[PDB]
Single-chain antibody, 236 residues
Framework: DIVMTQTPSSLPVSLGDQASISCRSSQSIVHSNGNTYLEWYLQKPGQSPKLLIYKVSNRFSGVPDRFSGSGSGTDFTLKISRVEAEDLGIYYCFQGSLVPPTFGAGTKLELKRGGQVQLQQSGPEDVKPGASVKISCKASGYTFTDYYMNWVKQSPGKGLEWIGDINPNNGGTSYNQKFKGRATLTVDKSSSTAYMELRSLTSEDSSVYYC??????????????WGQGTTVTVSA
C-alpha cells in the first residue's frame, strides 16, 4: 500500500517571497504506461477545493503562472513566487497514479506577521448511529457523461480521503478498500445526477463530503471538485 508524505505541516511566508512544498511518496508513483498523475490542490478556508496543477507540472486553466512545480519518482516540489492574499490557503498533493489514490497531510500557507459550470449538492444531514444517507450531486454546465465521479471525505481531524469513483456510462464503480464498498456510488443519467450512500456511521464518519468532477489531464478523466460539498454530522 502506498503512503503520501507532505512537508511541511505548516508554513509562514510574507508577500512576494519564494514558497516551496515537498511531496515525497513511499515509492515511485510513475504509472506503468509512462505517465505520472500527481495534482496540486488549494483549499481556501470556507470554500470549494480547486485544482491548481494536474499531471506533474501542467497548470489547470485559469491559474496564475507564478504557481509551478515539478518532479519525478518520489520527489515532487511545488513552488509559488510573488505570493498574494488570494494564494492563501491549505495546499494538498494528490496522487491518482496507483489505487487507492492517496492525499497528503496538507500544508497551511499562512503569512509572516510584522511590519457557469457547477455541481449542486444536498443540504446538511443530521444522523443517528447507523442510519443511512443519500447525498445527491447534480451536474450543470458541462457534459455529465464525460467525467468520472470521485467522492472525497474531509474532516479537520482525519484530513482528506478518497471515497471511490464511478463511470457514468456503465456504472463503473471502484471503491476504496478502507471503505470496503460499504458505501455505494450510483448514477442516474436522466437528470444527470450522481448519488452516494453509506450505512454504518461512527463518530469518525462525521465529515464533509465532496464529489470529484473535473478534467482534462490527458487519457484519463475527472480529478477536481470544484463544487459545494455536504456537511454530514453523526449526532449521538
Amino acid at each position: 500500500d502506498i503512503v503520501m508524505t507532505q512537508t511541511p505541516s505548516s508554513l509562514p511566508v510574507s508577500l512576494g517571497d519564494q514558497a516551496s512544498i515537498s511531496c515525497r511518496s513511499s515509492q515511485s508513483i510513475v504509472h506503468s504506461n509512462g505517465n505520472t498523475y500527481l495534482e496540486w490542490y488549494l483549499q481556501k478556508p470556507g470554500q470549494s477545493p480547486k485544482l491548481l496543477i494536474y499531471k506533474v507540472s501542467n497548470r489547470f486553466s485559469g491559474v496564475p503562472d507564478r504557481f509551478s512545480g515539478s518532479g519525478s519518482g518520489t520527489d515532487f516540489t511545488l513552488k509559488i513566487s510573488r505570493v498574494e492574499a488570494e494564494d492563501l490557503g491549505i495546499y494538498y498533493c494528490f496522487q491518482g497514479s496507483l489505487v487507492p489514490p492517496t492525499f497528503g497531510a496538507g500544508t497551511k500557507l499562512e503569512l509572516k506577521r510584522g511590519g457557469q459550470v457547477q455541481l449542486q449538492q444536498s443540504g446538511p444531514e443530521d444522523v443517528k448511529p447507523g442510519a443511512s444517507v443519500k447525498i445527491s450531486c447534480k451536474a450543470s454546465g458541462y457534459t455529465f457523461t464525460d467525467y468520472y465521479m470521485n467522492w472525497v471525505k474531509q474532516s479537520p481531524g482525519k484530513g482528506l480521503e478518497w471515497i471511490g469513483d464511478i463511470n457514468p456510462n456503465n456504472g463503473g464503480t471502484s471503491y476504496n478498500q478502507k471503505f470496503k464498498g460499504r458505501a455505494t456510488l450510483t448514477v442516474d443519467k436522466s437528470s444527470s445526477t450522481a448519488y452516494m450512500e453509506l450505512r454504518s456511521l461512527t463518530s469518525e464518519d462525521s465529515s464533509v463530503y465532496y464529489c470529484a468532477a473535473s478534467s482534462p489531464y490527458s487519457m484519463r478523466a475527472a480529478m477536481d471538485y470544484w463544487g459545494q460539498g455536504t456537511t454530514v454530522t453523526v449526532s449521538a
